[PDB]
Amino acid sequence: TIRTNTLKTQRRELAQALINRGVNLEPIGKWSKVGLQVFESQVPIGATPEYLAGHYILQAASSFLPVMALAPQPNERILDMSSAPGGKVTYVAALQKNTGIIFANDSNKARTKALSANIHRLGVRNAIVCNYDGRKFPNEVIGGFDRVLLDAPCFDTLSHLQRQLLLSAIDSVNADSKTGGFIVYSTCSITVDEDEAVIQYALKKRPNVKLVSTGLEFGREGFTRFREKRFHPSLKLTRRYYPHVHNIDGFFVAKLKKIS
C-alpha cells in the first residue's frame, strides 16, 4: 500500500501516472480516499519517478489510520511522540496542508535522519526534527501541543514505557487549546495488556482525560472484559484491527480528550 501525498499531486493524477507506468493500483477501501493498494507492478514502486518526486509514499493502511483518527487541524500545534518512520508525520502534514507547527521527535538518530530525508522528499516545510526523550519532552522540551500523536512501539517493559509515554503525551496535550486537547494513541500490536491495560492505566492516572470515539469506520471495539481483567466502559471506543478481520496489520487506536 502506498499513500499519495495530497500536497504533491492529486489521487486521480497519481492513479493515472501509475496506470501509465504499468502498476496495477486500486483504492484501499472507502475509509481512505488517497491510499492506493498495488496488486501488480512490473516497474519498481520505490524507483518510480513519482515516488522519487514525493507524489506517493509507501505507508501501511493501519499506519495511515492513526493519522485519520488524530485528525490534525490547520494552524495547530501537533506533536508526535515517535516521528519514525515519517509516514505518519507526512500524512499529518498533508492533512494540515502545510499549516501549523509539527513537532517531530525521534529518540533514534539513525531513524531521525531517514525521517528528515523523507520529509525533505515529501516537501514538508512546517516540520521540526528534534531528538529528545518522549517522557521528558512535555516538561523539558515543549508542551501545550494542540494535538498529540503517540505512536507507541509495540512485554512488561514495553507496556511500562508505553504508559510513561502516554502520560507525557497527556501532559503535553493542552486542554485549553481552541482545536481541543485530542491525543491519539496507536499501537503496532493487538495485545490486550499493551493497549487496553495502558488505556485504563492512563485514564486512572489522569482523570481529566476522557476516552472518545476514534471515528474510524472500521475496526473492532475495545474489549471491556478480558478473563479476570475488566476494562472501563469507555474502552470500547478504541478501534482494533486484525489481519483476519480488516485484512490489514493488527493495530489498536484510541482517542482521548483533555478537559483540564
Binding site: 519517478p49 507547527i101 525533505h120 512546517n126 521540526i128
Partner: protein, 174 residues
C-alpha cells in the same frame, strides 16, 4: 545554530540570483509569514518564524535538520550541494528547459542534457547561466548549467551537449 553573517548572506545571494534573478526578494520578504533563512551547522535552512521559534528550543547539536536546506556552506562558500530547494526555485526560475523522455532518464541518472534530447528552451538562455530543467509534465527535474545559447542551439548537431547537469531529483534516492 547561528545567525547568517552579512558576508555569508551576500555570498549565497549571488548564487540564488544566478538561477532566480531578482525573484529572490519574493522569498526574502513575506508579510504573510516571517519565513527567512537560518544557518544550522553548515546547512542553510529556509524556515518560518514559528519554525525558528520551535527550533529555538531544540539544541544546535541535537537539531539535525529543519525546514528545507538550500545547500551546505562549503569552505569556498558554495551552494546547491542539496537539491531540496528545487521546488522553491521552480516557481521563480527565470529560464526553464523542457527535456523529452529520451534525455529524461539520463538527466535523472545525472548525465548532461544533450542537444538531441532538448525539447523546449526559453529562447533567451545565456551561456554559463543558471537554469532549471523541466519535464514534459511541467515537473522540476534538477539543476543544469547551459554553456550554449538558443541562437547557436537552433542549428546544432544531435551529438552536441548543451546543458551540463549538476543536480537531479534522482539524488534524493541515490
Amino acid at each position: 545554530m547561528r545567525p547568517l553573517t552579512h558576508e555569508e548572506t551576500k555570498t549565497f545571494f549571488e548564487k540564488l540570483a544566478q538561477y532566480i534573478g531578482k525573484n529572490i526578494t519574493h522569498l526574502i520578504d513575506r508579510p504573510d509569514d516571517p519565513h527567512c533563512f537560518r544557518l544550522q551547522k553548515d546547512r542553510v535552512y529556509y524556515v518560518s518564524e514559528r519554525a525558528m521559534k520551535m527550533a529555538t528550543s531544540v539544541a544546535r547539536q541535537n537539531l539535525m535538520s529543519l525546514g528545507i536546506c538550500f545547500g551546505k556552506f562549503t569552505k569556498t562558500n558554495k551552494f546547491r550541494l542539496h537539491i531540496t530547494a528545487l521546488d522553491y526555485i521552480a516557481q521563480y526560475a527565470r529560464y526553464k528547459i523542457w527535456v523529452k523522455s529520451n534525455g529524461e532518464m539520463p538527466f535523472l541518472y545525472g548525465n548532461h542534457v544533450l542537444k538531441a534530447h532538448v525539447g523546449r528552451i526559453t529562447d533567451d538562455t545565456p551561456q554559463h547561466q543558471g537554469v532549471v530543467i523541466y519535464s514534459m509534465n511541467d515537473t522540476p527535474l534538477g539543476f543544469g548549467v547551459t554553456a550554449r545559447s538558443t541562437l547557436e542551439l537552433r542549428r546544432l548537431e544531435p551529438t552536441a551537449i548543451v546543458a551540463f547537469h549538476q543536480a537531479d531529483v534522482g539524488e534524493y534516492l541515490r
